[model samples]
Target: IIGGEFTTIENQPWFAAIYRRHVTYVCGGSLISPCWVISATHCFIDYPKKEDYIVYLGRSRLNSNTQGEMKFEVENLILHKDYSADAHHNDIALLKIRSKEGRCAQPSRTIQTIALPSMYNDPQFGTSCEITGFGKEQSTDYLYPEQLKMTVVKLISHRECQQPHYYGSEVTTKMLCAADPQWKTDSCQGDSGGPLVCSLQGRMTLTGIVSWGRGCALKDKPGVYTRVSHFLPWIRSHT
Candidate 1:
């Protein structure tokens, strides 16, 4: 959201907001089905409990009472076994979103699911895409979380992003890098685990999971994302 417009994902209904208390917006997630969500593993490293998190959906503004808005207490937390804070590998997780009714989820006008990447799905380098979040509109050192926002960022190739000045060998096949070439816009501190959707086959499809970055909108560094296509097996294993 660093250099983007205030926008809504009303049509992008799968975007979910992760919160710490009822008051603090923490990370972002993608609803893949009525009952399941996908996010970054690092999001749960420190607070790895179902009770500590809340998922909000169907609204643009976090607090506004827009009809069809929904909130759910996480029923379970599933982090990838190989995920490591040190290695930053396999940084993906799944959430079982449960309504108090004990049902998976009830669909409404503002709530729906997004298509997950197929096993054969993959985006070519430099493909155009969009990332949406209520993440920081500022830097990593400070933040100004606001209404949902949307911005365009292009896919960054591995060799280009791993230059000594950038990720410098940290980039992996499991992760994808993206950025606004001018370095004006990107996901910041509070934007973890959100969807990095790309246009495919005439539809916007889930492609990446916001994972990490050195800083917000740094000129030489693009944000890294868990390449969802590479984890379809892992995702289906649990969800």
Candidate 2:
């Protein structure tokens, strides 16, 4: 909640902090199941080993830890088969974990699972949807945020997002664009692999995965996300 400063992590229980080491928080994720966390494929720079990753749930600050913080060791990586770093296509991945012999996560007040998007269509267009991350304070803030932050951005139709000065032809059906094209409030680096949850029919469904964008929050350009609805089968395949 860098943009929406002072936001708390408890509000977004499904959020997970995936670290390269036990210390360096790299990408964001969502707890889809007690044992599975979903994130972006591009977040893996060099095909890291399972032991190279750690997860933090229910933590507000990255500089330190909290009693409510639940840590887990990654068991394996389920990266998409067609994920491409060149263009960030099919940019999705899943992390498996083990907290006990038969369990992956210990349920708590500050830890929970987010619902996946159904095969049902259409994003929450014409509405302000919330995106949570620890990306940056603003376009000028390069360092990652110490506390989790959130912001609201409007989902733009793919047709309009493909115009000049925007995504152009890079906008694919597998991706969705969102922002004010007029107001640039959006996600940035370090925010990648985070969840973009949207309310639909009284349900908060995981809609997108923070993929990439031109800038943190620049006018006329929006954040590009890997549409979760497009990857339902793939997600189920590994789950």
Candidate 3:
């Protein structure tokens, strides 16, 4: 919930609960393990050398003018080897953080590692999915609170999204699909690397990772995301 149009981390407490750690700027990410975070590869495209990014595990507010104690330092960064900045393929990255300092708190400080879907579990086109992030609520200049802002979106077919007038010819099969046809409910700039989650057995499973978009909430235009299941083998190998 850290980059893009919005700059401030102001909003509800619950949204701030799942932030991750990394080097340089604060980019949105999801906790895939006690020591790992899943994020967007584009966030590191500039390759900032300083490890200024830190994952704040169990907090719901960014009111502090400075840094907070809940923030944890990142140990390493594992961006997908196939990730491309130009075409945006393999836009996912994994952040490895230092181990928890004390007894881990479940359902709170405890990170929720979303389940990765099976390769065969492809959702039908037009299926409904949910996305959460600290992106802008209305304007493009600010980020909403620690509480996660939830919005529902639909799947966009690769053929439709790849139209020359749409995402252009750069869209590919490697990218997993989902989009907001209404355009009102879509991921914004800071929401990159955040999860596109779906509920199964009362558990949220990660379906995609925020990749890119033509713009924020434009009619007939929706955000693109990296499919999580497609890279399960690579994820497991790296983690």
Candidate 4:
């Protein structure tokens, strides 16, 4: 696996605080609104009970030593109606936080929404993209606590990703895209539900959600993600 640190906060400062207050452990999510967060449904597969997790906001790092700037109780979890753990279908979820009296009232804590791509929106293959997560820098088992890491990768062609020698039967239209080949910088275990954002028309839009992968940083193997464009209708219907 690729073993290296990420860009410092001084480099990409905007993403540092975006959705800072809506971070979650099981499934990483971004704050779409004051009370709403978008995440992956598979993150809650084992823990159906919403109380098992906490939604943290305004945390600069993930290490326990760093105290969160704000914390909100999760009032409810909105798993996709057709979410399936066995097949990993509809692997997305939304969290609704209980209202706070004075929290998240500041501009820095304000929520920022990411645009959902249309199901027909087909980005060019080999296009470069970015992903951020608290997953381990080198191994899937070691997770980064206080620090957030970002990596850039290219999109793989569906034809190549669906080859029988690779994911073949596992690759489907629901999960439409795969990352470029890389051993050390690919998404790992703790990154499920994090956004795979891309730049389009001068704006950054969420194109994929971290879903599954064979392993971290393996040559010829890239992380697979749920295609957000395919689920745009479902997302709009639920939101």
Candidate 5:
């Protein structure tokens, strides 16, 4: 994340990491249940094989092992049937976690589940929220942060985000836009599929998943996320 503060697993227990061959960090994810993870469809489309990736949960540091980190093999990779790579519509996916013995996550203080957004409502415009990820610290560099980072952002209404000065008509109903407005804080490279959590009804809910952006922390180019509430039925039926 750009202009973000370092955080810990205790602060974001549901945060998960997607890695290629346990060597390259691909994207970020969130644990919705013990066996289910919510992420971005674009993150795995190229390398769809389950054996090529590993999901690391309850961890802060990226390159090194953290105290409560647990690794899980992906049992399945399910992407939305209507997911469009060109416009990034329905840009969401799920990863089913598993172990050799059919075990999933064992929730603890540093490893817990995050509830999905309210089925009947969406986060209102101008609502304050947080985006967490282990993405790039700057746009010009490929330096992905070693520790999890978080930054504050405000939700941008679909109408305002669709202005010609911003993304125009590229921002769709399936996506949500958010940024610091001053272009100071945002999700960057390697941050895709990370959680865009917002407090709703006294609980932090998984409201969005980092999906795409024009650039890192660019003016009028806010990070676009997959609106989580719109996919509740698909998630439920698959899980």
Candidate 6:
């Protein structure tokens, strides 16, 4: 993540690293239940096979096997039926995890579930939140892909984000925008599907899912994420 500090599983237990057949890192995800993870649908457009991915929980270093890391095979790839690649609306996807023991993940100090935001818990404009990812530090750099990074960014109003100078009408209601005040921090390549969390009701709620953007930390272009609240019905029907 651009301009972010290194973080750990202890600090962000729900964070997950999704990989392509255990060899290539694909995107980030969040464990919302023992057998389910939430991520962005675009990440799996080319690799839709259930056997094409694996998930790592309780992980810190991407290539290293941390003490409590749990590796899970993906049993299902449930991309939203209405997800449109052209406009990137309904860009969320869920993966049902599998393990040899017929279990997925067991909660512990370094692995747990993240709370989903209720309709009433939506944050207002200017609300500060945190995003965690193992994405690149720059548009051209994957310098710290193995290290998890955390950065603070404030929510940007939809009207401000959709101004002609910014994303224009391209910023849909299905998306939420956020960025560092100076536009120096953001989720870059490889961070898709990660968690963008905000403290609501005294708990960290999953408010957004890293979706897409113009470029990594570019001026007048904040990071766009899947607005979690808008998809409550879709999520509940499946989960």
How many steric clashes between backbone atoms does each model show? 0, 4, 13, 12, 0, 0
Q: What are the per-model C-alpha RMSD values against the true structure?
A: 1.7, 1.8, 5.0, 4.1, 1.1, 1.3
Question: Could you give candidate 3's per-residue lDDT for residues 177-215 as a string of tens digits?
Answer: 566655656777667787787665555677788888766
Q: What tens-digit string does per-residue lDDT give for candidate 2 at 24-129?
A: 8788999999889999988885756777888888887877886688888888888888977554899999998775354588778888899998884656567677
Give the residue spans of candidate 2 off by over 4 A: 100-102
Please provide, for model 5 over 130-217, each residue's C-alpha lDDT reduced to its tens digit, 9 standing for 90 to 100: 9989899999975888889999999999998999999998898878999996889899999999999999989999999999999889
Over the full model, what C-alpha lDDT does candidate 6 score relative to the true structure?
0.90
For residues 1-239, what per-residue lDDT tens digits would candidate 4 score against the true structure?
Answer: 13435643322222222122234455466565566666787887667676656665444466442342445556677788787654377788777665356343122532345666756675788888887677666664554545767787778878887887677757677775545555457878677777787776666778888887777777766788888878777777766
lDDT of 5 at 76: 94
Off by over 4 Å in 3: 1-25, 48-50, 64-70, 99-110, 142-147, 200-203
Backbone clash total, candidate 3? 13
| TM-scores of all predicted structures | 0.93, 0.93, 0.78, 0.81, 0.97, 0.97
Poorest stretch of ten by lDDT in candidate 3: 7-16
lDDT of each: 0.83, 0.82, 0.63, 0.64, 0.90, 0.90
Q: After superposition, how far is residue 198 of candidate 5 from its true place, in Å?
A: 0.3
Better candidate by TM-score, 4 or 5: 5
lDDT of 6 by residue, 102-205 (tens): 78899999999999998635789899999999899889884656778989889999899989999998889888999988998998888899999999978899
Across residues 1-239, which tens digit of lDDT does each residue of candidate 1 receive? Answer: 78877876575688888787646777889899888988988988888877889887787886675567777889999999988765278999999988777767667767788898877587788898888787878884465555788788999888888788988888887788999879998888777888999988887889998888987898898999998989888888898
Instruction: Please estimate how well model 3 matches the true structure, expressed as its whole-model Cα lDDT.
Output: 0.63
